[PDB]
Design an enzyme around this catalytic site. Structure first.
Site, PDB file in Angstrom:
ATOM      1  N   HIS A  46      -4.413 -86.529   6.075  1.00  0.00           N
ATOM      2  CA  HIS A  46      -5.615 -87.348   6.435  1.00  0.00           C
ATOM      3  C   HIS A  46      -5.513 -87.922   7.839  1.00  0.00           C
ATOM      4  O   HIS A  46      -6.534 -88.174   8.487  1.00  0.00           O
ATOM      5  CB  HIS A  46      -5.883 -88.508   5.325  1.00  0.00           C
ATOM      6  N   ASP A  97      -2.121 -85.045   0.083  1.00  0.00           N
ATOM      7  CA  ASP A  97      -2.045 -85.753   1.417  1.00  0.00           C
ATOM      8  C   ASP A  97      -0.653 -85.690   1.973  1.00  0.00           C
ATOM      9  O   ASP A  97       0.104 -86.669   1.946  1.00  0.00           O
ATOM     10  CB  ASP A  97      -2.428 -87.309   1.305  1.00  0.00           C
ATOM     11  N   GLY A 196      -3.468 -98.065   9.533  1.00  0.00           N
ATOM     12  CA  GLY A 196      -2.448 -97.930  10.559  1.00  0.00           C
ATOM     13  C   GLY A 196      -1.046 -97.683  10.037  1.00  0.00           C
ATOM     14  O   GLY A 196      -0.149 -97.286  10.789  1.00  0.00           O
ATOM     15  N   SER A 198      -0.633 -95.587   7.386  1.00  0.00           N
ATOM     16  CA  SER A 198      -0.722 -94.279   6.664  1.00  0.00           C
ATOM     17  C   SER A 198       0.271 -93.265   7.253  1.00  0.00           C
ATOM     18  O   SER A 198       0.779 -93.462   8.372  1.00  0.00           O
ATOM     19  CB  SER A 198      -2.118 -93.678   6.787  1.00  0.00           C
TER      20      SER A 198
HETATM   21  N1  LIG Z   1      -3.763-101.258   0.721  1.00  0.00           N
HETATM   22  C1  LIG Z   1      -3.061-100.208   1.046  1.00  0.00           C
HETATM   23  N2  LIG Z   1      -1.836-100.069   0.558  1.00  0.00           N
HETATM   24  C2  LIG Z   1      -3.639 -99.188   1.951  1.00  0.00           C
HETATM   25  C3  LIG Z   1      -2.942 -98.018   2.312  1.00  0.00           C
HETATM   26  C4  LIG Z   1      -3.551 -97.075   3.177  1.00  0.00           C
HETATM   27  C5  LIG Z   1      -4.863 -97.311   3.680  1.00  0.00           C
HETATM   28  C6  LIG Z   1      -5.501 -96.374   4.525  1.00  0.00           C
HETATM   29  C7  LIG Z   1      -6.821 -96.648   5.008  1.00  0.00           C
HETATM   30  C8  LIG Z   1      -7.583 -95.666   5.840  1.00  0.00           C
HETATM   31  O1  LIG Z   1      -8.716 -95.934   6.223  1.00  0.00           O
HETATM   32  N3  LIG Z   1      -7.037 -94.489   6.079  1.00  0.00           N
HETATM   33  C9  LIG Z   1      -7.775 -93.443   6.741  1.00  0.00           C
HETATM   34  C10 LIG Z   1      -8.176 -92.385   5.867  1.00  0.00           C
HETATM   35  C11 LIG Z   1      -8.888 -91.275   6.343  1.00  0.00           C
HETATM   36  C12 LIG Z   1      -9.217 -91.199   7.706  1.00  0.00           C
HETATM   37  C13 LIG Z   1      -9.992 -89.980   8.231  1.00  0.00           C
HETATM   38  N4  LIG Z   1     -11.393 -90.033   7.837  1.00  0.00           N
HETATM   39  C14 LIG Z   1      -8.826 -92.241   8.586  1.00  0.00           C
HETATM   40  C15 LIG Z   1      -8.095 -93.372   8.102  1.00  0.00           C
HETATM   41  C16 LIG Z   1      -7.478 -97.849   4.657  1.00  0.00           C
HETATM   42  C17 LIG Z   1      -6.865 -98.761   3.829  1.00  0.00           C
HETATM   43  N5  LIG Z   1      -7.588 -99.944   3.440  1.00  0.00           N
HETATM   44  C18 LIG Z   1      -8.024-100.934   4.357  1.00  0.00           C
HETATM   45  N6  LIG Z   1      -8.779-101.956   3.885  1.00  0.00           N
HETATM   46  C19 LIG Z   1      -9.208-102.938   4.709  1.00  0.00           C
HETATM   47  C20 LIG Z   1      -8.859-102.905   6.077  1.00  0.00           C
HETATM   48  C21 LIG Z   1      -8.081-101.831   6.533  1.00  0.00           C
HETATM   49  N7  LIG Z   1      -7.681-100.872   5.663  1.00  0.00           N
HETATM   50  C22 LIG Z   1      -5.547 -98.493   3.324  1.00  0.00           C
HETATM   51  C23 LIG Z   1      -4.935 -99.428   2.456  1.00  0.00           C
END
Ligand SMILES: N=C(N)c1ccc2cc(C(=O)Nc3ccc(CN)cc3)cc(Nc3ncccn3)c2c1
Length: 245
Positions: A46, A97, A196, A198
């Site tokens: 991803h 993933d 960030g 991931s």
């Molecule tokens: N809570 C967690 N453990 C966790 C782990 C991975 C996440 C990945 C992401 C994320 O956006 N990853 C991501 C996935 C796919 C793409 C490409 N389209 C681009 C980017 C987001 C999370 N949640 C989040 N919520 C509020 C603010 C910021 N982020 C995630 C949360």
């Protein structure tokens, strides 16, 4: 990484910092990775599926701050980007993933193990830690869901593995999380991985060995109540991993 503590790369020597150069010369942080073998880093498909050209990525090893050269770091380009052919993304959940990056130096070399640069061991087939185990995650990701900047110094925290059965419950993730995915979180929802982070490591101590048990993959919110981090269960992809390396 919400809460936790700042730390430095000598306490996480297998952590890889993956950046991307843009047209015009700027460079920004993308995702984390883990060093598997001297020439191979493992991360999440991803983080690279929408910009799949291997030439744009930069990889650092032995790096502790987002924006400075730490003594002893090394910088790499990507000889080979391998995405999983069956990757997909649903509204929340992502599938298969998992990605490999064969790294090399400008001189043509793989990583040279040192005090700040080391590999992390893969798991064995059918043998993951039991639910309730405490494990660590590290990354340069967000310290609060509402920040729009990542911290300048590396962070770590500790979270506990959660069973499939609990994580498939209605107020957690229902049928959206499958047996190929591992759930992990804080019983008090004060600390977590976040955007960030991931592609980075979930490292579990199992039978006295540190193991790359999961890859940071997805989650609803960050450190939100009854919403765990969800991670790729590396032990299922040992057939896939060995064949593409
Ligand atoms: N809570 C967690 N453990 C966790 C782990 C991975 C996440 C990945 C992401 C994320 O956006 N990853 C991501 C996935 C796919 C793409 C490409 N389209 C681009 C980017 C987001 C999370 N949640 C989040 N919520 C509020 C603010 C910021 N982020 C995630 C949360």
């Amino acid at each position: 990484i919400i809460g936790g503590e700042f730390t430095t790369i000598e306490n996480q020597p297998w952590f890889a910092a993956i950046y991307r150069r843009h047209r015009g010369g700027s460079v920004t942080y993308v995702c984390g990775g883990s060093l598997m073998s001297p020439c191979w880093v493992i991360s999440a498909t991803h983080c690279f599926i929408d910009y799949p050209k291997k030439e744009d990525y930069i990889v650092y090893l032995g790096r502790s701050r987002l924006n400075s050269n730490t003594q002893g770091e090394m910088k790499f380009e990507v000889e080979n980007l391998i995405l999983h052919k069956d990757y997909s993304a649903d509204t929340l959940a992502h599938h298969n993933d998992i990605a490999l990056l064969k790294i090399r130096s400008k001189e043509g070399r793989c990583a040279q193990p040192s005090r700040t640069i080391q590999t992390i061991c893969l798991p064995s087939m059918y043998n993951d830690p039991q639910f309730g185990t405490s494990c660590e995650i590290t990354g340069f990701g967000k310290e609060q869901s509402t920040d729009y900047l990542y911290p300048e110094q590396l962070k770590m925290t500790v979270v506990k593995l959660i069973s499939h059965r609990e994580c498939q419950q209605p107020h957690y993730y229902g049928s959206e999380v499958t047996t190929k995915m591992l759930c992990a979180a804080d019983p008090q929802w004060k600390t977590d991985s976040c955007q960030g982070d991931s592609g980075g490591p979930l490292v579990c101590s199992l039978q006295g060995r540190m193991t790359l048990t999961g890859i940071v993959s997805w989650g609803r919110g960050c450190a939100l109540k009854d919403k765990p981090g969800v991670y790729t269960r590396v032990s299922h992809f040992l057939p896939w991993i060995r064949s593409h390396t």
